[PDB]
């Protein structure tokens, strides 16, 4: 009746010896936590990385936020820490007639389930989130000014997020193309009820999430395996929220009660995250929550060689969706390949396979396209190309490996999915455009067997 908290996700105390490699952690809780989507992590009691900073001179804009169950809000669009801190305090502290602490954690859900499902009730609240600047960095110590010797002992941590995307068993740590959004860390300020919609990662990553200070952060997740049916549970009650978008800065995200999915047989699992905890997401777990109160968090994507074959199978889905990429996969492959003798070894082995398969089906592409009367060849260097200049017309996806070009249409490419999308012109006027020939891949095949041995 009224809310019905769901199950609780995982919690895992590791000893130092399971934390200190976090890949080799998140690889052995996998088996359990992918059944649930998301997981907390309590580090070692005395694993405590400094927090400090002058909430005077730490400013950002914020962002704001309607609070109504099932409506539209898009993905991404002046106070100081302290101004935003006396409004958020304020807030809560009026709205429950209550000290902002002495608050229930359950009360505060409970409320939030109720107030999002009221069309009278027209609570705004506003938040933070923007990557790490100049004008508001990490909350984890970065190199730099002298260094205390509490903060250079965290510098290199593994957990420090700012570590965990160029560490050595992590995947987007050779990836040229400066994908911010997805190798720099995100920086959340909270505040009483500001939420974060139900989505998934870009392209079915992990994301780990840090709460360095403040009043617990309350989390929703379910497992990989329920993503379509979470999806269609609700294009069934929020179609709007499907239809095609402009590009990536246009997708349409909602807020949605876990009870309505837990009644449509879709797992989720709930967690209140405390300071100094951990979050972790896995690849195309549904998540969303809401903050207790004024807080501070520290969020980051990360690819594991667990996730490679997942991430084509993404690419592969968004092609489907018309979906715009955020880089390409197999460029990404193909960068690890011609660094493959100073990847780490079961890299390599993993990136290997992912590479047979892209080869294969980029085999079978070409023979398809060549059946249909495209003759004409040329070489490209697709990786110089800006993204928007290297999109297929048709499914928006991201070219490298190949695609087919018309002179009659100056610039613009089609993928080799969708050959009849360019143009009207015969095929025999066509040109494949392709970045290598097999005889370019399996010495880069190769290269990686022998150092994966
Ligand atoms: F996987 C690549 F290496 F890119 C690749 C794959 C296939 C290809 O052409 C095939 C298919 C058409 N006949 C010759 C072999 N050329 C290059
Ligand atoms: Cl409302
Ligand atoms: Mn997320
Ligand atoms: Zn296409
Ligand atoms: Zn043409």
Redesign the pocket.
């Known amino acids: 009746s009224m809310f019905l908290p769901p199950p609780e996700c995982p919690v895992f105390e590791p000893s130092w010896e399971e934390f200190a490699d976090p890949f080799a952690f998140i690889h052995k809780i996998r088996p359990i936590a992918e059944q649930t989507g998301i997981c907390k992590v309590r580090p070692p009691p005395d694993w405590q990385p400094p927090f400090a900073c002058d909430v005077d001179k730490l400013h950002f804009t914020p962002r704001i936020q309607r609070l109504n169950e099932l409506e539209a809000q898009t993905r991404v669009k002046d106070y100081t820490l302290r101004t935003f801190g006396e409004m958020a305090d304020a807030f809560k502290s009026d709205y429950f007639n209550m000290p902002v602490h002495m608050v229930p954690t359950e009360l505060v859900e409970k409320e939030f389930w109720r107030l999002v499902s009221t069309i009278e009730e027209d609570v705004t609240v506003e938040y933070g989130a923007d990557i790490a600047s100049k004008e508001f960095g990490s909350g984890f110590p970065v190199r730099d000014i002298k260094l205390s010797p509490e903060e250079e002992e965290y510098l290199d941590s593994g957990w420090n997020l700012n570590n965990m995307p160029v560490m050595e068993q992590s995947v987007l740590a050779h990836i040229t193309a400066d994908i911010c959004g997805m190798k720099l860390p995100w920086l959340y300020v909270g505040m009483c009820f500001s939420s974060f919609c139900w989505h998934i990662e870009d392209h079915w990553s992990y994301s780990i999430n840090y709460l360095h200070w403040g009043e617990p952060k309350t989390w929703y997740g379910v497992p990989g395996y329920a993503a379509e049916q979470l999806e269609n549970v609700m294009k069934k009650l929020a179609p709007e929220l499907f239809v095609s978008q402009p590009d990536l800065l246009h997708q349409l995200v909602t807020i949605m009660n876990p009870n309505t999915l837990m009644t449509h047989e879709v797992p989720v699992y709930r967690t209140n995250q405390c300071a100094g905890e951990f979050v972790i997401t896995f690849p195309r777990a549904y998540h969303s929550g809401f903050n207790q109160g004024f807080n501070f968090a520290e969020a980051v994507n990360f690819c594991t060689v667990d996730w490679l074959p997942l991430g084509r199978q993404c690419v592969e889905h968004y092609r489907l969706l018309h979906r715009y990429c955020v880089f390409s996969h197999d460029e990404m492959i193909c960068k690890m390949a011609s660094k493959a003798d100073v990847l780490d070894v079961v890299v390599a082995s993993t990136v290997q396979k992912d590479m047979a398969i892209?080869?294969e089906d980029?085999?079978a592409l070409?023979?398809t396209v060549?059946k249909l009367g495209v003759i004409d060849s040329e070489r490209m260097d697709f990786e110089l190309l800006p993204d928007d200049e290297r999109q297929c017309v048709k499914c928006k996806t991201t070219c490298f490996?190949?695609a087919i070009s018309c002179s009659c249409k100056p610039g613009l490419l089609v993928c080799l999915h969708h050959v009849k999308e360019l143009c009207s012109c015969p095929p025999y006027k066509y040109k494949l455009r392709?970045?290598?020939?097999?005889d370019?891949?399996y010495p880069m095949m190769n290269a990686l067997k022998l150092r994966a041995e």
């Open positions: 892209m080869i980029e085999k070409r023979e060549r490996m190949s392709y970045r290598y020939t097999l370019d891949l």
